[PDB]
Design an enzyme around this catalytic site. Structure first.
Site, PDB file in Angstrom:
ATOM      1  N   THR A  99      -4.060   5.359  -3.694  1.00 20.90           N
ATOM      2  CA  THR A  99      -2.970   6.054  -3.019  1.00 20.90           C
ATOM      3  C   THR A  99      -1.679   5.994  -3.825  1.00 20.90           C
ATOM      4  O   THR A  99      -0.939   6.981  -3.895  1.00 20.90           O
ATOM      5  CB  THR A  99      -2.761   5.464  -1.628  1.00 20.90           C
ATOM      6  OG1 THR A  99      -3.991   5.522  -0.895  1.00 20.90           O
ATOM      7  CG2 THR A  99      -1.716   6.250  -0.888  1.00 20.90           C
ATOM      8  N   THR A 100      -1.378   4.843  -4.427  1.00 22.85           N
ATOM      9  CA  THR A 100      -0.163   4.735  -5.227  1.00 22.85           C
ATOM     10  C   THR A 100      -0.291   5.484  -6.545  1.00 22.85           C
ATOM     11  O   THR A 100       0.691   6.062  -7.025  1.00 22.85           O
ATOM     12  CB  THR A 100       0.170   3.265  -5.482  1.00 22.85           C
ATOM     13  OG1 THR A 100       0.187   2.556  -4.238  1.00 22.85           O
ATOM     14  CG2 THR A 100       1.527   3.130  -6.144  1.00 22.85           C
ATOM     15  N   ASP A 147       0.838  -1.190   0.000  1.00 24.10           N
ATOM     16  CA  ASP A 147       0.000   0.000   0.000  1.00 24.10           C
ATOM     17  C   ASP A 147       0.877   1.245   0.000  1.00 24.10           C
ATOM     18  O   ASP A 147       1.839   1.337   0.766  1.00 24.10           O
ATOM     19  CB  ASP A 147      -0.922  -0.008   1.218  1.00 24.10           C
ATOM     20  CG  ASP A 147      -1.934   1.120   1.195  1.00 24.10           C
ATOM     21  OD1 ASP A 147      -1.558   2.267   1.509  1.00 24.10           O
ATOM     22  OD2 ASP A 147      -3.110   0.857   0.870  1.00 24.10           O
ATOM     23  N   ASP A 155      -9.299  -1.211   2.598  1.00 28.66           N
ATOM     24  CA  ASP A 155      -9.416  -0.719   1.227  1.00 28.66           C
ATOM     25  C   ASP A 155     -10.705  -1.209   0.577  1.00 28.66           C
ATOM     26  O   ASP A 155     -11.415  -0.437  -0.082  1.00 28.66           O
ATOM     27  CB  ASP A 155      -8.208  -1.160   0.402  1.00 28.66           C
ATOM     28  CG  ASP A 155      -6.973  -0.325   0.677  1.00 28.66           C
ATOM     29  OD1 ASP A 155      -7.113   0.790   1.220  1.00 28.66           O
ATOM     30  OD2 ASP A 155      -5.860  -0.783   0.345  1.00 28.66           O
TER      31      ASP A 155
HETATM   32  N1  LIG Z   1      -6.398  -7.466 -13.520  1.00 28.53           N
HETATM   33  C1  LIG Z   1      -5.935  -6.228 -13.808  1.00 28.53           C
HETATM   34  N2  LIG Z   1      -5.438  -5.934 -15.027  1.00 28.53           N
HETATM   35  C2  LIG Z   1      -4.977  -4.709 -15.326  1.00 28.53           C
HETATM   36  N3  LIG Z   1      -4.963  -3.684 -14.462  1.00 28.53           N
HETATM   37  C3  LIG Z   1      -5.433  -3.839 -13.206  1.00 28.53           C
HETATM   38  C4  LIG Z   1      -5.956  -5.148 -12.797  1.00 28.53           C
HETATM   39  N4  LIG Z   1      -6.348  -5.021 -11.518  1.00 28.53           N
HETATM   40  C5  LIG Z   1      -6.099  -3.742 -11.142  1.00 28.53           C
HETATM   41  N5  LIG Z   1      -5.550  -3.042 -12.150  1.00 28.53           N
HETATM   42  C6  LIG Z   1      -5.144  -1.619 -12.108  1.00 28.53           C
HETATM   43  O1  LIG Z   1      -4.286  -1.390 -10.993  1.00 28.53           O
HETATM   44  C7  LIG Z   1      -4.623  -0.168 -10.343  1.00 28.53           C
HETATM   45  C8  LIG Z   1      -4.693  -0.406  -8.845  1.00 28.53           C
HETATM   46  O2  LIG Z   1      -3.374  -0.494  -8.322  1.00 28.53           O
HETATM   47  P1  LIG Z   1      -3.172  -0.385  -6.736  1.00 28.53           P
HETATM   48  O3  LIG Z   1      -2.005  -1.244  -6.323  1.00 28.53           O
HETATM   49  O4  LIG Z   1      -4.527  -0.540  -6.092  1.00 28.53           O
HETATM   50  O5  LIG Z   1      -2.750   1.162  -6.643  1.00 28.53           O
HETATM   51  P2  LIG Z   1      -3.672   2.215  -5.857  1.00 28.53           P
HETATM   52  O6  LIG Z   1      -3.629   1.734  -4.432  1.00 28.53           O
HETATM   53  O7  LIG Z   1      -2.990   3.534  -6.101  1.00 28.53           O
HETATM   54  O8  LIG Z   1      -5.021   2.098  -6.521  1.00 28.53           O
HETATM   55  C9  LIG Z   1      -5.971   0.276 -10.877  1.00 28.53           C
HETATM   56  O9  LIG Z   1      -5.843   1.559 -11.492  1.00 28.53           O
HETATM   57  C10 LIG Z   1      -6.365  -0.741 -11.922  1.00 28.53           C
HETATM   58  O10 LIG Z   1      -6.688  -0.071 -13.141  1.00 28.53           O
END
Ligand SMILES: Nc1ncnc2c1ncn2[C@@H]1O[C@H](COP(=O)(O)OP(=O)(O)O)[C@@H](O)[C@H]1O
Ligand SMILES: Nc1ncnc2c1ncn2[C@@H]1O[C@H](COP(=O)(O)OP(=O)(O)O)[C@@H](O)[C@H]1O
Ligand SMILES: [Mg+2]
Ligand SMILES: [Mg+2]
Lengths: 53, 528, 532
Positions: B93-94, B60, B391
């Site tokens: 957040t990321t 996170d 989350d």
């Molecule tokens: N199966 C998947 N394939 C492609 N992209 C994905 C998938 N699952 C999540 N994502 C992308 O990853 C991002 C989420 O990353 P995450 O580690 O949750 O960062 P944050 O905490 O900033 O949201 C989202 O913007 C989503 O579009």
């Protein structure tokens, strides 16, 4: 067995989950006059703790 | 001693010019690069060592950034941005940190030339308005009554976390907790995941045994062994006042002259305790929970009525129990009413887990609070699981409040970038270049996803851009596990519109805030 | 020979030292002037970060040792206190005046002559501003207030969103309008509570048609929303009664102790029962409330808030028509609460703002109140938002109180420079030089404005001076008095038509304060620094 202080664990628990914003760092005194006018100044009825290290 | 004439203090440091702007931009870029690799379904976790001796294992962004102490004020601003994003929507957040870093990079490109920062800021604000408009245009609605779609949304939210292996269990737990903690009173709807829906983590066992309880569980035991440890349909009474004789507020010295006055005073202390216990018993309850102490004599008098008593319960826990079992906390026992008695809890049971006693009230009918019992390998694993569940619950609440839905996997980023690029063709000013640059800066999310997946960034990104140049391809993103282009209405990765709006707004305003600074003064005394 | 335990500086040395200190203070903030100015980010020794564009805040946070520099900093603080705007301009003008006065003094011009010339120039500049450069706001309507707010909020973090923030500021100021004795309308700014919360964008900041409380309900069992609120404002705590120092409880018959202890809380129970029986729904107190009284309010189905700030409670009480009660004692020696002491509002709601809750008292009757909740990216940005918002509120208040405005963008400075350069030739022989130097030093504002935009400062200032000279000489070219600076395009522009306005009080007070500070510093020609 109340002396074993089971409450110490949960004290640590919410001390860990204390706050949200940045936790800040301990103030560091760099000069002897800095320590002298830090203790001399500041409100009298407020406790000041100094850690020699 | 020697006296040098000075205007400001000796320890006052001032720097200004292009150096300050470059330093701020590189500080933001470094902050982004710290967590660049923690985004996407194939993110890698990080070990954070606490200054207090603890260990944080997480991917996170907020935890990683909050565990890092920095000196440059731009990095402090970026960490504050991360915390703001976490507190507002609980997700993205990321992404917001990376977006802010990319926007500040493309701004530095212009500041190297002879463009004033105010022009870049105005272009950024125009672009932000256009991004908001495009995001609202490409969004789709969701049916909150459809449990399957809500579970899918929560899953797509948690596919990037360590808890994704037990996706169905985590999604069901989060959905059930959010749904039952949802409340409505006096025409004011609320969710309040912070106060209720408590997460309790007990190390040991298997994580497949984790569940959301139909009630509240606390780490407490009966005050005395003769108490019943298993009641079928308890009637619960909650209190704050102690059940023991205590000193008054005023100075109340006594003066004993007769022989029997001492024994009389002790007898009236006992009689006062008995009167309090009788006032409690008049309501005929089965369980008595107090936020403060209960005297031994009070325990005896409660036993005479066959009543289980638990003492020294935290105020938050007592409020949670009140919401779960439908009781009202009463301070003065003599003012107890029938409607203050908590009927609705379908089972109370004190069972031993490991070497500790835990109190369960877990059969409530329509409870408005819950305990999420987490069991797992160790403390750090359970902490990460709790963060992931937080989350998920935040995402569920965001969807419940705002039923708008936005394609994920970088599809929304590319769609907004293409729309802004097309819009910029009809301005013919000096602000078109920063506008287009900050529009194309949104492509850092699909690029980061491709990089983390391990695929070819340039070819995949070019193909995605070419696809998005078409007429209906707003939902085309990247598969973060296989590194291939895919339609998100088929993959199923969707995100709340609120999260995307907050991310874009926060990133653009962070860039605007850091673009307004050219002078740094440091070292002066706080003066207060 | 003197044998004084200290250091002594006399004459040109101390004069140059004072001028250097003032010039350094000016140069610190000269980069933060005008719409093309940029903010500064200050870091304390404990790591606290402040990002600001306000001159007063910068000079207050700075730690300053030189007495003349301290004089300039206090000048900025005084300008902030008495006007609220033009804090950077007054410091820059004072430093430039001091520099030019010292340049004159170095030419064997006596400082008294320079001071007399400066006083004459300031008086004539104020007269000329009041007689030629003022614009009455009666013929401009509401657009004048919007334009003034826009001009004030330029160079601030909320400058680009000015189209929204100016409307917010004007509505907030107009919501607190009242007329005191003599029928003069007054606008008590600082009665608009400003709450800062990070979160959504700037454009989603809210203007509350009522009051906003940074407080929550005492107990979770109370309702979070009351429709027809009957607000009761109290100035006393609701806790278990305790006797004073002069009263003591001594028990000789044991049977009385239980009755004593029962009455000890029955007193507060009866007081709360009276307060609730009058019909109140919302109870606000500056003191604390303990658990028993909280449960009384919970059972009554009423909202109770504790530890309310005194100023907030006073504002809420007067906006809702309630009366602050420090005791439930009437003139008959009894303990009564009357319904006439209850304020009313159309709604009282505890709303959630970024994982936190605050109380909104919506649409108070018998008086309109205003509160502003600022949303930003983080805490520093919200703080800068609050400072800029306060500046805009002060500017709008000054415009509404005194209905005269002056064109911005350095038009006033150029007109004054031309007029005073012409006027100096009719007064004295050396005060002539002093007035000429006053006029020349007044040009530091447009010069700094042009420099901050990386424009040709010399050519733009020359064009502005030519325009104003044509306006003053030619009799039918009086419309050129409004020609100011357009920093976006780097060209002269009719600022009256463009909407770049300032209150006249800002310019007048800045001129007077800068002249007085310059005279005070110029009065020194010897410094004795006693050793501590
Ligand atoms: N199966 C998947 N394939 C492609 N992209 C994905 C998938 N699952 C999540 N994502 C992308 O990853 C991002 C989420 O990353 P995450 O580690 O949750 O960062 P944050 O905490 O900033 O949201 C989202 O913007 C989503 O579009
Ligand atoms: N839109 C504008 N166009 C041209 N000049 C402006 C504009 N807005 C403000 N100014 C000028 O910029 C100068 C500096 O204002 P500023 O420094 O922000 O206020 P303060 O002096 O209170 O800090 C003012 O004298 C004003 O005349
Ligand atoms: Mg996420
Ligand atoms: Mg200003």
């Amino acid at each position: 067995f109340l002396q074993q202080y089971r409450k110490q664990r949960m004290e640590e628990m919410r001390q860990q989950l204390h706050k949200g914003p940045q936790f800040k760092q301990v103030f560091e005194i760099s000069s002897g006059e800095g320590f002298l006018d830090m203790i001399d100044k500041e409100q009298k009825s407020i406790v000041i703790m100094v850690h020699i290290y | 001693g020697h006296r040098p004439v000075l205007v400001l203090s000796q320890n006052t440091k001032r720097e200004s010019g292009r150096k300050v702007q470059s330093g701020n931009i590189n500080a933001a870029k470094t902050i982004a690069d710290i967590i660049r690799t923690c985004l996407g379904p194939k993110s890698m976790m990080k070990m954070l060592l606490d200054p207090m001796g603890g260990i944080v294992m997480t991917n996170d962004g907020n935890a990683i950034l909050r565990e890092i102490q920095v000196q440059h004020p731009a990095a402090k601003s970026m960490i504050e941005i991360s915390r703001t994003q976490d507190e507002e929507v609980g997700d993205g957040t990321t992404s917001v940190i990376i977006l802010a870093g990319e926007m500040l990079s493309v701004a530095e490109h212009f500041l190297e030339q002879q463009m004033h920062p105010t022009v870049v800021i105005s272009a950024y604000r125009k672009a932000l308005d256009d991004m908001i408009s495009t995001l609202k245009k490409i969004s789709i609605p969701v049916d909150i009554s459809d449990s399957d779609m809500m579970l899918n949304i929560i899953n797509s939210s948690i596919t990037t976390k360590a808890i994704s292996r037990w996706s169905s269990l985590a999604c069901n737990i989060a959905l059930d907790a959010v749904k039952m903690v949802q409340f409505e009173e006096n025409g004011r709807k609320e969710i309040d995941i912070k106060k209720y829906a408590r997460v309790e983590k007990i190390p040991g066992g298997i994580i497949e045994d984790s569940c959301v309880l139909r009630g509240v569980m606390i780490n407490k035991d009966v005050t005395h062994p003769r108490m019943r440890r298993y009641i079928k349909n308890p009637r619960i009474v909650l209190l704050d006042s102690s059940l023991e004789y205590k000193k008054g507020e005023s100075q109340t010295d006594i003066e004993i002259t007769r022989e029997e006055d001492f024994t009389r005073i002790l007898q009236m202390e006992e009689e006062y305790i008995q009167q309090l216990c009788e006032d409690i018993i008049q309501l005929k309850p089965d369980v008595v929970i107090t936020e403060k102490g209960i005297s031994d004599l009070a325990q005896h008098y409660l036993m005479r009525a066959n009543i289980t008593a638990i003492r020294r319960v935290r105020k938050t826990d007592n409020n949670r129990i009140a919401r779960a079992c439908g009781a009202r906390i009463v301070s003065r026992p003599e003012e107890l009413r029938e409607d203050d008695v908590g009927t609705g809890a379908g089972l109370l049971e004190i069972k031993k887990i490991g070497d500790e006693y835990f109190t369960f009230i877990t059969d409530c009918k329509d409870p408005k609070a819950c305990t999420i019992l987490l069991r797992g390998a160790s403390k750090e694993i359970l902490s990460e699981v709790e963060r992931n569940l937080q989350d998920a619950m935040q995402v569920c609440r965001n969807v419940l409040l705002d039923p708008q839905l936005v394609p994920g996997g970088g599809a929304s980023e590319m769609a907004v970038a293409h729309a802004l690029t097309e819009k910029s063709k009809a301005m013919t000013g000096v602000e078109q270049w920063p506008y287009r640059a900050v529009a194309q800066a949104l492509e850092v999310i699909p690029r980061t996803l491709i990089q983390n997946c391990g695929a070819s960034t340039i070819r995949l990104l070019t193909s995605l851009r070419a696809k998005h140049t078409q007429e209906n391809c707003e939902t085309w993103g990247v598969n973060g596990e296989t590194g291939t282009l895919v339609d998100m209405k088929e993959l199923g990765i969707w995100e709340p519109l609120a999260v995307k709006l907050q991310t874009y707004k926060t990133a653009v305003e962070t860039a605007v805030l850091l673009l307004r600074i050219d002078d740094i003064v440091s070292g002066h005394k706080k003066k207060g | 020979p003197l044998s004084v335990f200290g250091d002594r500086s006399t004459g040109e040395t101390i004069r140059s030292q004072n001028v250097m200190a003032a010039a350094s203070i000016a140069n610190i903030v000269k980069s933060s002037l005008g719409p093309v100015g940029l903010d500064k980010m200050l870091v304390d020794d404990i790591g606290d970060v402040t990002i600001t564009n306000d001159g007063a805040t910068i000079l207050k946070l700075l730690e300053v040792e030189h007495p003349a520099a301290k004089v300039l900093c206090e000048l900025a603080d005084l300008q902030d206190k008495e006007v609220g705007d033009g804090t950077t301009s007054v410091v820059i003008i004072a430093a430039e005046l001091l520099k030019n006065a010292d340049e004159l003094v170095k030419q064997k011009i006596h400082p008294t002559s320079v001071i007399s010339g400066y006083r004459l120039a300031c008086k004539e500049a104020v007269r000329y501003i009041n007689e030629n450069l003022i614009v009455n706001t009666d013929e401009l309507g509401r657009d004048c207030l919007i334009n003034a707010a826009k001009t004030s909020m330029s160079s601030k973090i909320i400058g680009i969103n000015g189209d929204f923030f100016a409307n917010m500021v004007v509505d907030a100021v107009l919501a607190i309008k009242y007329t005191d004795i003599r029928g003069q309308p007054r606008y008590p700014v600082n009665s608009v509570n400003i709450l800062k919360a990070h979160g959504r964008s700037q454009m989603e900041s809210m203007l509350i048609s009522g009051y906003a409380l940074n407080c929550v309900v005492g107990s979770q069992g109370m309702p979070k929303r009351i429709v027809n609120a009957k607000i009761a404002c109290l100035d006393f705590s609701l806790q278990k009664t305790k006797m004073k120092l002069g009263v003591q409880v001594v028990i000789t018959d044991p049977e009385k102790l239980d009755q004593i202890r029962q009455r000890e809380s029955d007193i507060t129970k009866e007081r709360i029962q009276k307060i609730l029986a009058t019909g109140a729904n919302v109870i606000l107190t500056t003191g604390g409330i303990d658990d028993m009284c909280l449960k009384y309010f919970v059972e009554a189905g009423a909202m109770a808030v504790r530890r309310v700030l005194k100023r907030d409670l006073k504002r809420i009480a007067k906006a809702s028509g309630a009366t602050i009660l420090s005791t439930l004692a009437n003139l008959e020696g009894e303990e009564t609460f009357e319904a006439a002491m209850l304020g009313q509002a159309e709604e009282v709601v505890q709303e959630r703002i970024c994982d936190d809750e605050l109380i909104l008292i919506k649409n108070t009757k018998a008086r309109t109140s205003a509160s502003i909740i600022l949303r930003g990216a983080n805490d520093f940005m919200c703080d800068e938002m609050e400072r800029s918002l306060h500046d805009a509120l002060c500017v709008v208040k000054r415009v509404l109180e005194s209905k005269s405005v002056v064109p911005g963008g350095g038009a006033v400075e150029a007109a004054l420079s031309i007029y005073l350069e012409n006027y100096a030739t009719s007064m004295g022989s050396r005060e002539q030089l002093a007035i000429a130097e006053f006029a020349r030093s007044l040009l530091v504002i447009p010069n700094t404005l042009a420099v901050n935009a990386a424009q040709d400062s010399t050519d733009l200032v020359a064009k502005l001076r030519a325009f104003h000279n044509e306006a003053q000489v030619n009799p039918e070219r009086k419309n050129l008095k409004w020609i100011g600076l357009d920093l976006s395009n780097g060209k002269p522009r009719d600022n009256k038509q463009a909407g770049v306005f300032e209150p006249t009080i800002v310019k007048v007070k800045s001129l007077k304060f800068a002249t007085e500070a310059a005279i005070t510093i110029l009065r020194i020609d010897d410094l004795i620094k006693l050793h501590p």
